[PDB]
Amino acid sequence: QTGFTTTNEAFQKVQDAVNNNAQALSKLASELSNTFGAISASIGDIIQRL
């Protein structure tokens, strides 16, 4: 009842699953919606420059 801390590496496994799907979703899909080669950077240079 008392202990659900870092030592409990069955609770940490729960935290691992949670972090795992959270980082698969948000981090990966969002940071890969940013820039690719370099110049395009955001949008595709629709009017901003090109």
Partner 1 sequence: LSLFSVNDFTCSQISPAAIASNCYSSLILDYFSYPLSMKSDLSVSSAGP
Interface with partner 1 (CB under 8 A) = 39, 47-50
d(CA 36, CA 28): 14
Cα torsion through 10, 11, 12, 16, rounded to 10:
100
**Nearest residue (CB) to partner 1, 32 versus 39:** 39
**Nearest residue (CB) to partner 1, 30 versus 42:** 42
DSSP reduced 3-state for 16: helix
**Nearest residue (CB) to partner 1, 22 versus 41:** 41
For residue 40, the minimal CB distance to partner 1 (Å) is 11
